[PDB]
Amino acid sequence: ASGIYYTPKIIVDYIVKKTLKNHDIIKNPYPRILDISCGCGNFLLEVYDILYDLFEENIYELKKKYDENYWTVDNIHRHILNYCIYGADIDEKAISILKDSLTNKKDESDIKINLFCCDSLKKKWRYKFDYIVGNPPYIGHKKLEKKYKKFLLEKYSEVYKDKADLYFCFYKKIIDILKQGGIGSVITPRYFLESLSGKDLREYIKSNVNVQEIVDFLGANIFKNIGVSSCILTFDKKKTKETYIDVFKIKNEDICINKFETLEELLKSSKFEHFNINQRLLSDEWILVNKDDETFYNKIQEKCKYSLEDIAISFQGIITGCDKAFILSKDDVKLNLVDDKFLKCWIKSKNINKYIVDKSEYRLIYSNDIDNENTNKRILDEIIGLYKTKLENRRECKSGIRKWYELQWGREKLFFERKKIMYPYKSNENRFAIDYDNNFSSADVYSFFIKEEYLDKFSYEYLVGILNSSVYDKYFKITAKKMSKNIYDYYPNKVMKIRIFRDNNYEEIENLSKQIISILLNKSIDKGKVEKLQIKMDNLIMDSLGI
DNA sequence: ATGGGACTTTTTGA
DNA sequence: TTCAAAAAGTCCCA
């Protein structure tokens, strides 16, 4: 709410060092370092200390090369505050605190400080900057105001579109006002590396700057008590012909960031893996994996001839708009007031397992089948109407498109009331299950059914067998969107792009999947046999894919 | 009190 | 008319 977030000191030190470790202060004693979202100035104070050390270490060389009277130890503070440090923020209080801190670093002429309290995306910047650091704000499409979103769409259409984020626009602004040959280094969410909304931002970054380094923390909790996954991006505008990116990807997401005094020590250690990515070979997606994973992914992609999107029709669950008004326990007495034709089985993401779905515990009132208010007054007055006001605040109800008691997005009943495959929208592993009970679900579970023309080619049992294998788990996680610790996004924009194969092992894989399903559906389950069959199927799939 | 695991709504642009 | 993406997630407990 306040917009002020405490970046860890080690991250700030690493970013400042990355920007300013190889700066020739003799050649250019007037470097412009800008923090576009400084806030309390965690980055700017470190920049001040680094610059003070740099000027003090080379004070006599500057005295020789330039005006000897101007370059004195006493005058370093004034020079840094006048020509070096620039900060911008939207909070007056934080800017005041930062100005006080910069003043207290060292009456006189009341040295001026280049601190601005305004919107960095609206400010007209007179000059470009040698170096840019800081941590931009992260605000999604839900928490962003409508008029500001219109402004972003009009002015930042190159990177902001649909469900994009504000830090996309901040990336664009940082790139735009970066001096030629300058270096920028920021910490942002890692989602733009793989999200669908980030495609335009990725294209802009690829085509406008050379990405020096990507540090991916995956699901590690960099910010305490904050539910976000972070990455560090360092880029330049220098004239270079190599265009190779160092990628440091974390291997253990439970590590403590204070293991060493410096972040580079952590990167060098066994807690991180390093590899190189050719920027010129980047596609719409950024496949930031090592050589072994790249070979694995390429083999799977080249071997497979079909994809899930080609052979299946996919859809999202029902979005009622107020779950408490339409979802009831199956053992609720109020369900006695609702006819069984209006009741549908309701499942959550946790109910989805491998090859099977847990028994339904909830019922959904498909209120779209209620013709009018008069005939079914009991249900509306005693069940749904308890949240009527909230139901009236939905967008479609305010515009009159939807009645107050109707589901906001009821989809089509025929899609759910058939044999299909369901999977949770967020999970730690591949969980694709055949639904035999015509289960309905919210958007936390996605569903798909095979097209008629591909039924003779692919069966549900074979699909769930291959998709739940460790091979396909690893294959999907190569390009999957990492959300948090042990959580990947399983959405149609990437699930439907999974490629599938068909060869001489189809029959045995289908038989093993059928055996696993039969064991799982039995009243008494011996799961060890299921694990053994899964191992056999994994071996068979690896044999099929030549890996 | 914080840290970490189980679990996941509906607002929103298109 | 109506699809689907979006964690500065959210809540609970030791």
Residue numbers in the entry: 26 to 131, 137 to 577
What do the authors say?
Accordingly, we purified CamA-DNA complexes and grew co-crystals, using a 13-base pair duplex containing a centrally-located A:T and with a 5′-overhang at each end (either an A or T). The complex crystallized in space group P212121, resulting in a structure determined to a resolution of 2.68 Å. In the crystallographic asymmetric unit, there are three CamA-DNA complexes (A, B and C). Thus, the three DNA segments form a pseudo-continuous dsDNA molecule, with two target A residues located on the same strand, while the third target A is located on the opposite strand, in a way representing the presence of methylated CAAAAA on both sense and antisense strands in the genomes of C. difficile isolates. The first 26 residues are disordered in the current structure. Here we describe the interaction of C. difficile CamA with its cognate DNA substrate, resulting in a rearranged A5:T6 base pair immediately 5′ to the flipped-out target adenine (A6). The shifted A5:T6 base pair stacks against the 3′ G7:C7 base pair, as if the target A6 was being squeezed out. Intriguingly, in the CamA-DNA cocrystal structure, we did not observe a bound cofactor in the SAM binding pocket next to the active-site, even though exogenous SAH was added during initial complex formation. However, the added SAH had dissociated during subsequent complex purification, probably due to the low binding affinity.
